[PDB]
Every structure is written in C-alpha cells, then in structure tokens.
C-alpha cells in the first residue's frame, strides 16, 4: 500500500510530458513541421515541447484533472527536431496530435489548436508553421471542394488547354452598367472568365445586385456571340453570413456557373458554409487568397502558403490563387510546384526540395484548380503553361483591359498566345527554351497580339525571393 | 486599331483562334496523344446541336446553374482503347467524315487515371456552315 | 488626356504629397520596406494603388470614371528613426470604397495583395483611423462594457475568469465537475478553452448542458452571477447558430467565438445574434500573433482589436504584459483604450499613429489571460483598471487544494488589491507587501503565494515600438 | 408478425411463407405512387413490355461518362437506365453531378428518337433528409423516374418516399437489394412473396421480381405466383404456386415487374413469355456489353423485343418457336446479329435452393 | 504501335480480375468475411471472385466502360480463402473494398453493395456474411451514437451497477391509461427503465400521443416517489 502518482502542484518542463523523440506516430496522427526560433537559455527540446503542450491539452503549470483522464492518449508530441542547415538558432519541430483532438469538417478548429497560441509565447522569437500531414482518416471528415478540376472541365466542356481569365480593372469606382460592358467586351474576344476585384463586393458606386445582373447579360450575349460556354466570377465575400448567402442565392437564381469568396479575410467557417451550399446548388466557387501574405510572405515566422492552400482544400474551393513565379507577386518556381501539386493531385510524396515536408495522402479528395494571376502579359505566356500545364487558370486583368485596342482585342491576343504554345507545346517544342520563338512567329501572324507583343515588351518582374526554401 | 467582329464569328474551343489545322498538324496532335498513351476517340453532331442552347430549362425549376443542352455529342463507335498507331486514328477520321459529311466532328482523348478527357478539337465543320469567320476577316 | 497604352509609374498617380485629408477618409499607416532600387515614393504609391484602384499597367477604363474621387492616395512618408530602409507611408482611402458594416470588405482592401509584391521586402500595418462616418455603418458590439456590467450587477472591481483544463481530453460531465468548483469559489466566469469545439471525447451539446447545470448550481450556492463562456467556433455558419441558439434556450449569460479562426463574416453573423438575443460574446484572438508578432510584417494587434470592435464583441483578449505569451506595456496600453474608450488621441509612444473617434460605439472589455497567478495581480490591477477580466485557468486549476480553493485564493488576492488602491496605497510600489499581507491571512491565498512564488515570466521583446 | 419469433430457442427454423392482408387493413395505406396504368399512360407507351438498362461497372465511372453511358443506351432503343443499386454519392460521383449530367442525357436521347425517357436515379441514402433532398432535385429537373433501395434504406424511409412521390408526381421504381439474405432458404426466413406485398403496401411503381431465367436464382412456378400478386386486383389460393391464401387487394394499385440480371438477347422470347406485357425487362451487361457499343446495343435489345411480340401477338407459340423467332431476327439486323453471336451459349442453369 | 489492352466483348471468368491472393490490404479498405457454400462444379476461387465482383464493380460480361476508368483503383478483391474446418463444401472468402466505394455515413449505402446482390446468385447454395473490418478512415464519417456508454451514465447519474428495465404486458391490448399505471408501479418499485414493447406504436386500442402522456405522467411521479432518475 504505497501511492503511485499523485497530483503535484507547481510548474515542470513541458519536455518531461511533451517531448517524445522515441514516439512512432500513427497513421491517423496529424503532423506539423513548426520553424521555430527559441529565446536564448531554451533549449529546443523544451521550446518544441512547450509547442506541443499549448496547441494540445497542456498549460503553464501542472493541472489536477489530468488524472481524471488519459493525458497519453490525448496529448500533443514533439517526437523529432532538425536543426536547420544554415541558421545558428533555428529548428524543425515536429508534432504529432491524436486526431481525437479535432472536430470532424472543420478547418477553423484545426487551425485553433495548432496556430491558435503558440506563436505569442514570451519563449520564442519566431515561429513559422511549415506544413501539415492530413491523414486520410481526417482528411474523410470534410465535404471538400464542391466540385474539383474534372468535374468542372466537365461541366463547361472545356478541355485540352489553360483556361483564361482577366479581373476588371480598375479595382474600384465602376458601375454596375459599366462593370456589365467591360466584361461582354472581354468575353466576347476568347476569354473564358472575368471577375470581380477581389474588393468589389456592395460599395455606393455600385451594388452588388445591379451588378450581378447587368454581368449576367454581359455573359449570356459573350456566350452566343462565341459559341462558347462563359462564366464571370461573381463576389459573395460580404460582412456577413446572411449577406454572403444572399449573393450566392442571387447567382443561383440568374443560372449562372461560378462565384467567387475570399476565404481568408471572409473566414474559414463562412467559406466552409459557401463551399456546401455551392456543393447542394451545382455553382463553382472560385477563391482568393486576399490577406495569404500578411501571413506567409516572411521565412522566419507566420504559416507557409502550402498549408493555407492544404486547408483551402479541405474547407472547399473550386479554384485557389498559386501565384504566377513570373509576375508581380512574390512566389518562387520550386516552392510554387510543389504546393500545386499538393492543390492538384491525390498523392504527393514527401520532397524537402520543394518544400513538402511530408507526404500527403488526399484519398480521393477533388482537386483544387490553381490560378495564375497578377502582373502576368502576353510574353509571360510559355512560361506559364510550361509551370502549370493545362490545369490552371491564367488571369489577365491589366493584361487584357490595358491592350491598346480594348477589350476584345485583348482577350484575343491572350487567347492566341496561349493557344500558340499549347499547339507548339503538343508538337514537340520546348517551352523553356523556344518559347520567345513561339510567341514572336505567333505575333507576326495575329495583329491583335502584335499590338500586346509591342506594349509589354521590355516588362518583367525580377527581384530577390524572400520566401525561399 | 482593328475591331473584332460580333458578327457570324462563332469559335469551336481549343485551337479555333489559331489558323485552320493542316493534315500535319492533325497528325502531329495525333502522335502527341499516341506518345502519352491517352485514348482516342471519334464524336459528332448534326448542326442544330453543335453549340450549347438552353431549350430544356423551360422544364426546370431554380436548378439551371452550369446545365446546357448539346455538350454531349454522339460517339463515333467506340473510344479505341489500347490504341498505339497513329494511322489508326487518321483511318477513323477519315472513316468518320465520310460517314457523316455534314455534320461537326472533333476529335477527343481520354485520360483513365484522371478519368478526364485530356484534349479535343474539330476536325471537321459542314461545309454550309455561315457562322464562322476565316483567321484574317475576324477583326475589321 | 487620352487612353495611353503601357507601364508607368506607381507615383505619377498614386504619390499625392500635399494631398489634404479629408475627414471622411479611412486612413493607414503602413511601416514598409522597400527592396534596393525602388524609391520609397514608389513603393508607397504601388501600396496605395493595388490597395484602391491601379494595377500594373494603364486600363482605358479609367476614364468612364473618376479616378481622382476614387483612388487611394500615399499622402505621406516618415523615415523611420533607427532604420536604414524602413519607412512610414500614410494612405488615405476614400470612403466610398468600402462596404457599410464589412470590416471583411475593408481589410480585402487594405490588407488584400499588397503584402505580397515582389518590389517589397516587408510590409506591417500598424494602424487605421476609422472615420465617425464609417464607424456609423457597423452594428459594432452586442453590449459593451457598461451594459455588461449592468445585467451581470458586478460592480467596483476586475471581473475574475478561468479557462477549463486540461485543453482538451475532458468529458462532458468532467467539464461541468471542474466549472462548478471554480465558479462556487469566487470566480465570476470560466470559459472553453479556445479549441474545445465538438470532439470525439466531448459533444458540444452534452457539455452545453452540463456546464448550464454548473452554472446554476454555483450561483445558488454563492448568491452571485455566474456564466461560463460556451464556446460556438464551427466548421460552418450553421453549427455555429445552432450552438449560439442552444445557449439562448438554456437562458445561460454568455457564449465565446475565435473571430480570427472562424473569421470577420461569421463573427459579425453571430455579434449580431447576440445583440438580437441577449446574449454576450467573448472573443477569444487565437491565431493573432501569426500576424501581429514580428515589428517587419505582419498587422499590429491595434489593428486586429480595432476591426474585432467594428465587427462585434462584448470582451477581447489583452495579453497580461506580465504573463506567458508577449505584450509590451506601452502597447498594451495604447490599444486597450483603444477598445475601451470613445476617443483616442494621436500618441506615438504607445503606438497610436491617429487621432481614434468611435462615435458612441460601444467599449471592449479586455480580457487579461496566460500564464498569470495571484503574485501578478497588484500588477494587472494596476495596468487594467477595474474594466477588465482577468483569467486564471492553470492558476486555478492547478491550485494544490483544488478549484474552489484556487478560485478563492484568485478572488481574495483580486479585493485586498482593489481595497489597498481605493485606500490610496500605490500597486507599483506597494503590491508585495499587500499580496503577503493577504496571504498571511487567507489560508487558501498562502497556498496560493507559495506554489508560485518564484515564477515569472521575463524574455526579450520582439515587438517593439 | 416477424420480430422476435424467429430467435426462440425452442425452435430450430421458421420461415414465413405468406400473409393474408385483409381489404379492410390494404385499405389504410396510400399504396404505389401510380402503378401499372397510369405509369404506361403518362409515358405514353402501350402494347409491349418496358426496356431498361444499368448502367456498368456498378463504381468507379465519374458523373460525365455516367450520362455518356445514359444518352448512348437510351438513344438507341430502351425506354429506362438505371443508377446501381449501389450508385448514391460516392468520391468518384457525387449525386447532384450525375443528375445533372443525366438529366441532359435524358433529353437529348429523348429530342433525338422523339420517344419518352427515363433513367432512375436514385434516391437511397444515409438519412432521411439526404433521400428527400435528392428527390427534390429530380423534381425540379423534370426528370420522370426515381429510384430506391426499400429493404438497405428501410420502410419507413420507403413510404416516405413513396407518399413524396404521389404528391410530385415522380415515378418509383423500386430495387430488392439484400432480399436474398432473408428470402434465399427454404428453411429460414421470408418468403420473396411476402416482401413483395409489403413493398406493394408501402409503395412503389415498379419492383424487381426475378428473370427465371439469369444469374439470380427465381425458379418458374413461384416466380408467376408473386407477379401476379403484385400486378393484379385479386388472386385466388394456389398452392402450385406458393400462394397460401386468397388476397383481395381491393383496388390498390398493381406494382410493375422488372426482370434484371444476367440476360441478353436470347433470353427475350422466354422473358416475353413469362412476364407478358406489363414488365420492364433490363439489360446492363446485356447492353453495355455489346462488341459496337451501348446504341447498337439497345437497338439489339429493342428488335429483340419486338419481333417477339409481334410473332406472339400473331400466334406463334414462344415456348417452343422462341429460339426461331431470334434467329429469323439475327438475320435481318445486324445489330442484334452481333449480339446473338457473343452470347450465343450463355445461360444459367444451376439447382434452385428455393423450392416449393 | 502493337495493341494494348483492348475491349473484348463476351463473358470471362470473375477470377480472372476478381480473385487476387497475392493482394496486400491497405489500412483504409473495408473487409468482408463471407461463410460461402458453392454449387458443385463451381470452384471456390470463381465463386469468391463472383461474390468480390457483384459487390463492387463487375457484371456477367465484359463492358467497354471500365476502360475510361480505372478498374484497379475500384474494384472489389477476393484476397484470401480458408476451407471450414468441419465441412466438406463451405470456406471463408475475404473481400477487400477500397473506401471509394462507399457514401459517407452511410450504413444503407454499405449495405447494399455488400449484401445488395450476391446472397441470391445462382451458382451459389448458400452465403452468410460472418464479420466486417470498418477502418478508421470510413468509421470516422458517421456521426455514431447519439450518447454512448458514459454520457448515458454521466446524465442519469448512476453508476456502479447493471441499469435495469422491463417491457410493459401484455405486448398488446392495454389502453393508454393502463400503460402509464403499469409504469407507475413497476418504476416506483426498483427498475430505472420500463419500455414500449417493439410492436407498441399507434394502434386503435392505443394511440402513441394519449400513451406518451400517461406515461411522461407515471415516469415524474415514480422519480418523485424514490429520488432516482427514471425514464420509459
Ligand atoms: O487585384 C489584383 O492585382 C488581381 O486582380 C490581378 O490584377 P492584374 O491582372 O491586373 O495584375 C489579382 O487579385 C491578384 O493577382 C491577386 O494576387 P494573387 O494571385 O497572388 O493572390
Ligand atoms: O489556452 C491558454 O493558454 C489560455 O486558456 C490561458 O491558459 P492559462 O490561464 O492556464 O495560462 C488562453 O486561451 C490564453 O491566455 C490565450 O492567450 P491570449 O489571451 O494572449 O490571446
Ligand atoms: O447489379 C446487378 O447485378 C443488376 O444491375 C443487373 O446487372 P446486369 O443487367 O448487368 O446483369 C441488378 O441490380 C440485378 O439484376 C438485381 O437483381 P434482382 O433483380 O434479382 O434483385
Ligand atoms: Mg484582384
Ligand atoms: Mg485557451
Ligand atoms: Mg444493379
Ligand atoms: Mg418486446
């Protein structure tokens, strides 16, 4: 009769507890790779720990009711630390959490335990959360994106190439009746898409609903004009979820294909119910990214676009923003395939060179149409459909409303272009290296694309990569 | 500055923005799905149901988001699975064509493990066909 | 001036130094820093333009309306003291950008794409002044800290709180067990912890439930108001109601929402609710200082609590200065009369970079919470002031006599504070001696004082004014 | 009737072989949706059984080649396709793309041969709200005909499905899946018949009663037994035939046959003989699994069909002229020529286990 | 330019693409173990190949349409056969299914493919399916119990001991009243539960809504009566 353990009062090393190095993780664990910082005197041990403590069941100072249940079962493990090659004081810290830990479907829990503390601790000086591994047993809880890349080919009968779109610029200030004819003149010249600015939501210049009708005129007159089928990206990104689903019920009602959220300044449990409703009324859901790179643009702290892209495709989107390597926003070419990859298909191994810290098995969840956009012209084209193939969606906004000619002519030019590389593409030529033949031969033939060819000439975007590897 | 044409300037997907395809092209497009081992296949429509319409809505209650009528078009036998020849496919088109000289033929391969189709474009239009402008007479 | 195919620059639009603001304008200050070769005109003016109404290169469209009514106008550019290539840059945005009662609407904007421009190394937003006549289109929050105090009767000292531990792992009937004894002991509030939604070993509506009979059972007991901050962060919309909707049937006080998790449309969706049913809700910023922590980039948290006010809360996490997780004081205290107060001055060494009118919208109870015991209370006491909650789950729950005990002891330490500072005595200077003066004479409080006597929590910095 | 009896440890077996459902107990139920008559009156289609098709393999075909497979069967000759009894929503397919893709398969097989079209697409599911949110959707398509898994989705789902489908306006056509783990002994369990009276009690305009003849056991004489209790008005005690009483059903509506399961085009003078008009008679495999493809294969089934029930309606003798009548058929189309040759010896001929 | 795989119309044995005994199983596939008795003349392989093909992907013949997908990915595998000890014309076959097959939460779904068709097959005399492996990944789709074990102790509050109930008599016959006074007594004496026989619902001797009363009537007047929580 002599006691086992008891309840101690007072404060211990989180690594007596969460620090697990000899743990075989299972096969239904959600792993995180955490970048982490520590202050001076942490050891990493006990900066990966603390981690793990307070994105799972544990706090600052030892807890009675742990007793009353199975802190084994349900606590959160580092299990192995990289020192980072290059860096005097940073490491990968990895976690393993039970997957009784979250709630089934929903993103913003996951999201909650994993980032939701951890990266204000007093202990650490930067945190950066890397990636995740889904289980598939996880993965199985969510509805997923509406749709997915096949399905949507599919429904508008469109195959064999990119697709091509183009924001309406400027970003503010039109009207409706003026948003409407701008986008039939894009349309109408070879575009499949336009859009709504990712801020063009209801404003005193122009309404929401005056503009959902006046560009469901501009897409019905494009569509028998060309013969071909067209969608414009109607926003429902609004202040609330009442507002957001009124929108939607709007696009349902006017029978057009595709709307548009801006998942993370919307947020994650509105997107989820927009992703459902899309699901139940047969609409595509196109999502930016607005707000990605306040979070992801920095390597030393915040939350790596592949994650935020990973959880995209659980909470639901037809199509996601990637980035475009050669425009104006930031995204390096290695980083960029790899996390494509990871939106696309439905398994990605584990390649460290890419940035894919684990492998990722999707079990058959849809995959997420990625969308090339931002600062991106004519000339840029063969290396557009050199990165991304043919599942992609390659935007020009300044691209096409800033041709010389207007509207249709730039959509033209740009529909030429990328149709000129995907046909020298199939017929053997190299994109990577015979692509400024291509679009020249192709800007001798089409005065539309000419005119493109001659305006953007000399422009490029090339500067020093902050979010590298 | 040139202007494009609204009028009789309908465009048929991948392909009908750059000039006409010659035989060398075709069979070029032809090798490139032979190479990749995606599986031919042969379809076809009358003119009436060449281009997407919208006549069966009219049964429909608020659910007519991304239907169309005339995406679907016939099959023209059966998609040649295991096909590894070329010459073959060049056969059926011609064979095909000949079958149904008036009508709209593409043709399309599938991808299995996608389970997709993976290209398409027309091979042949009506020759009646008015609705169309030649590359040089689509801006004026 | 005619339709003008092609690149130019930023700055030939978008660059308005002598620009006049007006006081209907939204307006932002954003510490930038430019990669080498770009002038900081430029990159100020890029910022303004892909924040309003330019991109890349010249749209003829620009001239069916008017771009001197519409565009965003870089106005103004501070070096920054310290800094060979940072920079203040001052944006002034018209109104008629944004959509009435839609903080989502505003940060697409404000914070949408411009943080990811090659031509840009870093970019922070460190604060907005939100103009009366936008201030005037939100709902805002469902209370507000005199209403709050008003139906709970609690009056002339800190409200007391404690989160449930451990995190996760405990049952529903576990749950309940654990509020009851912390509620019974003197604690006006406990809460779920962030991430207890709806999980294999709790259902959230078993908790609900539970915690309801908790509630109840302590407030008979002590004579006291009692609530328990139910958690209804969700997957969707819906769940989230559903929840909301069951706290409202079982009459109980209070619910909590992660408004960064769950997001600014769902936050302003359930603030709304709340207002329309009598119902108060706590914010809890989970993911925050995925944002808000590095000085480089990010949005400073000013920002963050600024927007949750606009959106609707009732309290907001604080940080404790003092606790586990950061917080500078000079900060902390900038922003948190930012929440609380009608007016905030322009004051640079707490960080307010405009002058803050909030039109009679309601105040922000912050929430002080992580990492705190009874020896940081004359120090909270005496940063907060009475209109805060202060939060003790570890140092309540870990209390070696268990919850009511730890509750008492929280309790005791909270009023001999509140008694020394209305008799006169200084909490800055005289705060040990009152606390061993309390412990002396409550047993439950000296337990208290010697489990945590030496711990504290002291690092560097690393967001610094 | 069938709760707990069945588990006493005092016997060693039960079966139950029948009920006699009295007029006055039939009469408290909405019954079928339509039944047979108003089924061929809304359709438009008289004087020669129903021809139907599943479309194949049972999983893995993605919501665009569903309607692929739908718009090539239906175009060349049958009235119905059919989701598997198995096709709900499922990672490879969810539900409301194949509806859609089906319901433009439908119409264009429909605009194309100027016949009415079909194809049942099912409402089975996890909940009831799912199986009502899906037939709310082919409601709203306009499509005529659900179907539904009565026995894996239940009763009480069934009649609720059923009673939605008399206020709409829906066809229901009604899958057996999992009968033959109660129905398959001689010794233990419930007689087929007695399944078929409660889904005539509960609902439904169409049920699958067996081929006879295909890959699923249903031997000759029980199989006319229970066709006729679930198509006629009043069928006397015949024990020959396994009909333990008298049943009276006092109006109710009469229940379609459909005959699935492993036939082809030699089967069809024997099915036509055994069924008569007033049944639907399927053919997946028998379908798509013709060496030309589905068209050619439906209009295989379709001659088939109708050389046999002209030389029927003529006075030829299918039991005995049968394999004369499909030969003198092979010879004038090709179609049906090509399917004659592949399954040529196919048949299926095993001891029955549920015997008299 | 030598064919591939092409179709080939016509009927093949089920083995031939349904039997696979060198199959490794992966931790996401749900398994069956169906207790198979043959016809004579027809080998255990064909016949587990028939019954793995019939409740998955396959028909009597070949068709053209497994071509645009992927039969590998999809189909239903016969993995393994045990003899039964014991008898002379009886195995165990073991089918592995890959989880694409099913709808998420639902029973009814899994169901029907896996007992839908193949128990009335011709070339069989007899099959019982004796157990079913539900991986975690499929387990975790359904919503499950409404309560379970604990939550249903933890609310009644009682613990320590077998919980104990009775089905009111007789089975039927009884008025509403008579119910409600039946569970009355029996509740006040001792059991925690009484129930409503299973073939109690709404007959003319006794309407559900009249007994629902009665009852929530006696179930408040015995908790009153002994101080423990009852229900009916
Ligand atoms: O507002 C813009 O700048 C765009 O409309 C593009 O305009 P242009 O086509 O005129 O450049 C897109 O929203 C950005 O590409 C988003 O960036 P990302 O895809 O990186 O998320
Ligand atoms: O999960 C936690 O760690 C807490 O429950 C506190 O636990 P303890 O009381 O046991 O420390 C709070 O959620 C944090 O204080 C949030 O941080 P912040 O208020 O800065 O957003
Ligand atoms: O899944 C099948 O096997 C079928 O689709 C037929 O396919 P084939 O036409 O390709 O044979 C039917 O569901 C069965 O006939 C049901 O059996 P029953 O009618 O006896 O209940
Ligand atoms: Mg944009
Ligand atoms: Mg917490
Ligand atoms: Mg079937
Ligand atoms: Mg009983």
Not at chain 1, 158 to 166: E, N, T
């Amino acid at each position: 009769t002599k006691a086992g353990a008891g309840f101690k009062a007072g404060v211990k090393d989180y690594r007596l507890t969460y620090y697990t190095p000899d743990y075989v993780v299972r096969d239904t664990d959600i792993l995180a790779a955490f970048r982490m910082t520590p202050q001076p005197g942490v050891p990493p041990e006990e900066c990966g720990a603390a981690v793990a403590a307070e994105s799972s069941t544990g706090t600052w100072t030892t807890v009675w009711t742990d007793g009353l249940t199975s802190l084994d079962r349900y606590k959160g493990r580092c299990y192995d630390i990289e020192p980072v090659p290059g860096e005097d004081n940073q490491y990968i810290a990895y976690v393993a959490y039970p997957i009784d830990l979250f709630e089934e479907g929903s993103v913003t829990n996951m999201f909650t335990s994993i980032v939701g503390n951890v990266f204000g601790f007093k202990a650490l000086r930067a945190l950066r959360l890397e990636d995740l591994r889904i289980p598939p047993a996880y993965v199985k809880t969510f509805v997923g994106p509406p749709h997915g890349i096949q399905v949507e080919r599919d429904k508008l009968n469109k195959y064999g190439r990119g697709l091509l779109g183009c924001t309406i610029k400027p970003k503010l200030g039109l009207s409706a009746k003026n948003y409407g004819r701008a986008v039939y003149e894009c349309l109408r010249g070879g575009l499949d898409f336009t859009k709504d600015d990712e801020n063009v939501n209801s404003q005193p210049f122009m309404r929401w609903r005056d503009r959902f009708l006046f560009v469901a005129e501009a897409i019905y007159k494009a569509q028998a004009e060309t013969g071909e089928v067209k969608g414009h990206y109607l926003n429902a990104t609004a202040g609330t979820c009442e507002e957001m689903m009124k929108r939607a019920v709007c696009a349902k009602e006017l029978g057009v294909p595709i709307i548009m959220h801006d998942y993370l300044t919307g947020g994650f449990t509105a997107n989820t119910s927009l992703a459902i409703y899309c699901r139940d009324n047969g609409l595509f859901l196109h999502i930016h990214r607005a707000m990605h790179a306040v979070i992801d643009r920095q390597r030393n702290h915040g939350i790596h676009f592949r994650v935020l892209a990973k959880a995209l495709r659980m909470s639901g989107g037809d199509h996601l923003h990637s980035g475009t390597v050669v425009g104006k926003l930031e995204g390096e070419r290695e980083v960029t395939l790899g996390f494509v990859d990871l939106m696309r298909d439905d398994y990605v191994e584990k390649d460290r060179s890419r940035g894919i810290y684990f492998t990722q098995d999707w079990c058959s969840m849809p995959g997420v149409m990625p969308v090339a956009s931002g600062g991106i012209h004519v000339w840029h084209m063969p290396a557009l459909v050199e990165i991304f193939g043919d599942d992609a969606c390659l935007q020009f906004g300044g691209g096409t409303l800033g041709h010389p000619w207007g509207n249709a002519p730039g959509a033209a030019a740009n529909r030429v272009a990328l149709e000129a590389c995907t046909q020298a593409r199939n017929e053997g030529r190299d994109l990577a290296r015979e692509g400024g033949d291509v679009i020249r031969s192709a800007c001798k033939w089409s005065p539309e694309l000419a005119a493109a060819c001659e305006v953007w000439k000399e422009i490029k975007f090339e500067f020093d990569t902050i979010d590298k590897l | 500055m040139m202007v494009w044409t609204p009028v009789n300037n309908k465009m048929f997907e991948t392909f009908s923005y750059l000039p006409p395809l010659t035989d060398e092209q075709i069979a070029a497009q032809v090798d490139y799905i032979v190479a990749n081992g995606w599986i031919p296949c042969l379809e076809f429509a009358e003119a009436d149901k060449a281009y997407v319409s919208n006549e069966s809505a009219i049964r429909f209650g608020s659910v007519s988001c991304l239907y169309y009528d005339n995406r679907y078009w016939t099959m023209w036998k059966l998609p040649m699975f295991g096909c590894r020849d070329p010459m073959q496919v060049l056969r059926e088109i011609v064979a095909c064509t000949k079958a149904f000289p008036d009508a709209y033929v593409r043709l399309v391969a599938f991808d299995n493990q996608k389970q997709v189709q993976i290209m398409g474009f027309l091979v042949q239009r009506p020759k009646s066909a008015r609705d169309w402008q030649p590359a040089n007479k689509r801006s004026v």
